[PDB]
Design a protein around this ligand. Structure first.
Ligand SMILES: CN(C)C/C=C/C(=O)Nc1ccc(O[C@@H]2CCC[C@@H](Nc3ncc(Cl)c(-c4c[nH]c5ccccc45)n3)C2)cc1
Lengths: 322, 246
């Protein structure tokens, strides 16, 4: 019965070096002096905080202490600085140290995933995502930089800074701007606030399309130009394929330069057919017909994926610095 | 995985305040003044029932690990209400919690905050988060009082009177250490059993088993009537000495 967080001090970890710029504070890599397990520390500074402990971190803790899954990043414990009241010091969130993220391995140009690499990766990403949606949680930042991958071949969702609950009984309003523009679905680009968990399925659809292209499918800087690029591939939104597209605030405002036809299977034919089937069902403009997380696990491209009989990828062991 | 946030009746007699010499009667008074301080300061600020109870639960849990002789209660009560506001998505500025605290405490009581009251509450947020082990999510008996009473079919006026009187009993149970003793589900069931006796209502006559006397066994599981009698006795003790009106 030692699940008491906040008491253990940070000196029990030997900091090796910074690994990135976090939301609240810098993120450090360290090894545990008691178990030798490499970890990562998310610093949460309190001194000179207008409202004290950041409320954004309070939300992440409330959620992480409810998400126990192989594919969801797990928070081991929370350690503090050296104390001794009337002293200043920060808190540190402890996570298991993943070796790589997705956005890096594809930019690295040194990696390339076969069809069995992608099947097992998407498999873990969808199973962990179905576990979150069933718990009535919405991740709102799914992207390449938020998909961590260790050298074992195990995929994990990364950070839930923008996660929230979801009332499945009765629809209630939520926050609009949430996801990075490259992975944001159309309904968010048109100003929907009563959106469903379908906003993640879209962002995951770009992850699948990015594994076969090594480059984001949609790359724009403004929401209007983003809707232009999406329509050029998925087709233009209109009531024929989306009965409620007329109800969106920016519908008539953000009209594509043309009325495009869906040529998705045309530009992505080098992809296997089963993967193209799942890609098509994940990039359907109408969220009411967009497949749920469970329906992707039932597709032909992932139904028979056995994770135990999977070979580890050709992942580099030489992390590019340190 | 999850910490245990419940104590025996013997565990509640050896609190850190009991060890440092404070008597049980005075500690019982320190918890009432603290709970009702959080309640009033939150009411004047427009906070609702799920936020006030969460802060009061942090207050009762805090003094399970620390003594009143080391931490002023009104200071901790303000820090608990300040945290619960951010935990329950209804945050109130630290400046507003102080401006409301001085309008409710006299010079002696507000003297607990010192020269810089805001700075004395910000620092206590560090130890409060460590004392509760970053276990922010808390359920309360109010939500269960509603759901349990909603499945009751019968006299509309009688059922409604049963709920509102039990609602006050839950407002009072926060003044005791019941939250430190039983799950909120058992507290919501207990206040209904107590309200049913004072109102002379046959609660089983409004369920699916009118012949089954233990009407509650369809809401919670494995709770003998003796446990309910214990919660009722502790709640009625607040009403002793004319401390409140029924
Ligand atoms: C050429 N070149 C470009 C130059 C050299 C540069 C560089 O890169 N350096 C470095 C970087 C980075 C690093 O790292 C790696 C990456 C990938 C993934 C990872 N993993 C992981 N694990 C765990 C955890 Cl917790 C995590 C997280 C979550 N979140 C966050 C936030 C922030 C940060 C973090 C993080 N992650 C590992 C390390 C090192």
């Amino acid at each position: 019965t030692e699940s008491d967080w906040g008491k253990r001090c940070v000196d029990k970890f030997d900091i090796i070096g910074i690994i990135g710029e976090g939301t609240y504070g810098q993120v450090y890599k360290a090894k545990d002096k008691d178990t030798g397990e490499l970890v990562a520390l998310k610093k949460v500074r309190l001194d000179n905080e207008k409202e004290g402990f950041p409320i954004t971190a309070i939300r992440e803790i409330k959620i992480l202490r409810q998400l126990i899954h192989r594919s969801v990043v797990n928070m081991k414990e929370i350690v503090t600085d050296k104390q001794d009241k009337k002293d200043k010091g920060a808190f540190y969130l402890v996570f298991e140290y993943m070796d790589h993220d997705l956005m890096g391995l594809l930019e690295s140009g040194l990696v390339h995933f076969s069809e069995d690499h992608i099947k097992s990766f998407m498999k873990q990403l969808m199973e962990g995502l179905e576990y979150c949606h069933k718990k009535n949680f919405l991740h709102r930042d799914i992207k390449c930089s938020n998909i961590l991958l260790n050298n074992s071949g195990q995929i994990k969702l990364a950070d839930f800074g923008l996660a929230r609950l979801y009332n499945s009984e009765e629809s209630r309003p939520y926050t609009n701007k949430v996801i990075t523009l490259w992975y944001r679905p159309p309904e968010l680009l048109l100003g929907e606030e009563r959106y469903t968990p379908a906003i993640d399925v879209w962002s995951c659809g770009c992850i699948l399309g990015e594994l076969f292209t090594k480059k984001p499918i949609f790359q724009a800087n403004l929401e209007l130009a983003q809707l232009e690029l999406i329509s050029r591939l998925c087709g233009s939104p209109c009531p024929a394929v989306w009965p409620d597209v007329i109800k969106l605030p920016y519908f008539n405002t953000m009209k594509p330069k043309k009325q495009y036809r869906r040529r998705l299977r045309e530009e992505f034919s080098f992809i296997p057919s089963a993967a193209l089937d799942l890609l098509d069902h994940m990039l359907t403009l109408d969220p009411s017909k967009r497949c749920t997380a469970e329906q992707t696990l039932q597709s032909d491209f992932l139904k028979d994926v056995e994770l135990s009989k999977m070979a580890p990828p050709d992942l580099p062991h030489w992390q590019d610095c340190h | 995985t999850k910490p245990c946030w419940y104590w025996d009746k013997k565990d509640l007699a050896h609190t850190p305040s009991q060890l440092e010499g404070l008597d049980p009667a005075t500690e019982a008074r320190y918890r009432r003044e603290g709970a009702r301080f959080i309640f009033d300061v939150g009411t004047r600020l427009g906070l609702h029932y799920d936020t006030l109870a969460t802060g009061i639960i942090y207050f009762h849990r805090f003094y399970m690990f620390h003594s009143f002789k080391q931490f002023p209660r009104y200071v901790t009560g303000a820090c608990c209400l300040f945290l619960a506001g951010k935990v329950e998505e209804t945050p109130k500025k630290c400046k507003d919690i102080i401006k409301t605290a001085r309008s409710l405490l006299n010079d002696v009581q507000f003297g607990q905050f010192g020269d810089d009251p805001k700075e004395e509450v910000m620092v206590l947020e560090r130890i409060l988060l460590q004392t509760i082990k970053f276990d922010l999510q808390v359920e309360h008996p109010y939500q269960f009082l509603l759901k349990y009473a909603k499945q009751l079919k019968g006299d509309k006026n009688k059922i409604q009177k049963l709920v509102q009187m039990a609602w006050t009993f839950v407002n009072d149970s926060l003044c005791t250490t019941l939250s430190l003793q039983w799950e909120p589900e058992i507290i919501a069931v207990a206040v209904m059993y107590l309200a049913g006796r004072l109102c002379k209502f046959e609660i089983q006559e409004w369920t699916s088993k009118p012949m089954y006397r233990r009407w509650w066994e369809q809401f919670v599981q494995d709770v003998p009537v003796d446990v309910l009698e214990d919660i009722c006795h502790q709640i009625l003790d607040l009403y002793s000495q004319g401390k409140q009106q029924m």
